[PDB]
Amino acid sequence: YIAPNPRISSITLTQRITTTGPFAILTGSTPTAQQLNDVRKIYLALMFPGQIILDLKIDPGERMDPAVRMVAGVVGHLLFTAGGRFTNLTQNMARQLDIALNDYLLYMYNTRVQVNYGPTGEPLDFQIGRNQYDCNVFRADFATGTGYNGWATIDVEYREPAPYVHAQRYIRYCGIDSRGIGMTYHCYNEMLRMLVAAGKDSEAAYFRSMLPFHMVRFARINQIINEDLHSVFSLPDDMFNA
Amino acid sequence: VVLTEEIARAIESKYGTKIDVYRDEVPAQIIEVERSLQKELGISREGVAEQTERLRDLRRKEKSGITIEGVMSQKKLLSMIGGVERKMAPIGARESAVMLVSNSIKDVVRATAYFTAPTGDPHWKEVAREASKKKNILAYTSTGGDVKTEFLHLIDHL
Amino acid sequence: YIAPNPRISSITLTQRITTTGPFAILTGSTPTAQQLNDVRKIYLALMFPG
């Protein structure tokens, strides 16, 4: 497990914590064995989409700053995929991530902007920005997967007859193929559209710079599924679709 | 010191120059204001009257037997005071979002974050372990050098 | 129950020269238990206005 930029953890903390805010407070933290085990759990869930689903470890003894849950709700929308032809999350977990992102989009600590809520109390049922731009799309819906990496982008396809006659499918993350510098995709572009409408230019630039690390990591994972895992024990195509 | 709190508050509102008010202590230097700077600062006629009674009392004092001089221009007043303010300065609800920082072991159940650095504490190993046992905890570490500046910067930012 | 920042507190030191101000009556005393009960039930009314 490697950072996007190696050795950045050992530089001085005053350099790393540049300013104030939830993301600034979160940056500078270091993980321990529990979070390492949970991270490799997440990666195993990514490596096996059709068999592993995830949910939160919620206990009555929790007490921490809300920013960590806040960032988790912000980032799980890009990290996980839902809808389309396969899902990686429970309805409860998707709902929790969505309400966390609702909390983030309503969290305002530098600048006060206008807000236009909707008829219901549903998360993201409002319009934001100087131009009215709808955030209600990212509310979770497993029919198409608007809020995750299955949004209007192909993920499964077929090229040639496989040696194993029940595993014809090719599983590609973010629609890219191994056989790419600077390429983007629909979900990420619309996330940046949301963020520039929210006017959070700090994390807009942060994510804009962090794109290539995400893309190369997902390409590597894509390679791992489409190459190493091809065996007789892979799930049949009809059962994977159903 | 200046003759009256009215002039003091006028110059405070115009810049914020905290100049003290005469209370008959010592034979010091006294600064007063005449017609041009009175018209500039826009004092009500009552304060100008008050300054006049004060000056005539000082003339009576010096005839009855402490140095008094008046400033003519705003540039001369600024050079005489020797200080210009920076405005701004709002006072918030509290200094930091963290209300408490401690080292005991009983409060590890309620603690939420911990910073680590090489220290000579008999229980640091213990408390670091039982703090890291949490599933969602906010841990920070030192990277050598001046750890005091890092801790103060971190506790300002958090 | 939290107290405000004491940067404003220099007003009572200004009040020495400006003694005519009835504000804050030069407060330097700790309130009593009955006064704390009074303010507590004031804030209870604030909690439950109706």
């Binding site: 921490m64 700053d65 | 200094e95 930091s96 979002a97 963290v98 209300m99 408490l100 920082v101 401690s102 080292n103 005991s104 409060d107 590890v108 309620r110 603690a111 939420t112 974050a113 911990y114 910073f115 680590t116 650095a117 220290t119 000579g120 504490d121 008999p122 229980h123 640091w124 408390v127 703090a131 906010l138 750890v147 005091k148 801790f151 103060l152 506790i155 958090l158 | 920042n5 004491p6």
Partner: peptide, 30 residues
């Protein structure tokens, strides 16, 4: 939120914390 810091750096920076009016609970190890 609450924070845990070592006693030596608390002793060294206790003037800043009392200037900022923060609460501190400490055990001195003699």
């Amino acid at each position: 939120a609450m924070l845990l810091a070592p006693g030596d750096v608390i002793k060294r920076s206790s003037e800043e914390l009392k200037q900022r009016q923060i609460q501190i609970n400490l055990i001195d190890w003699t």
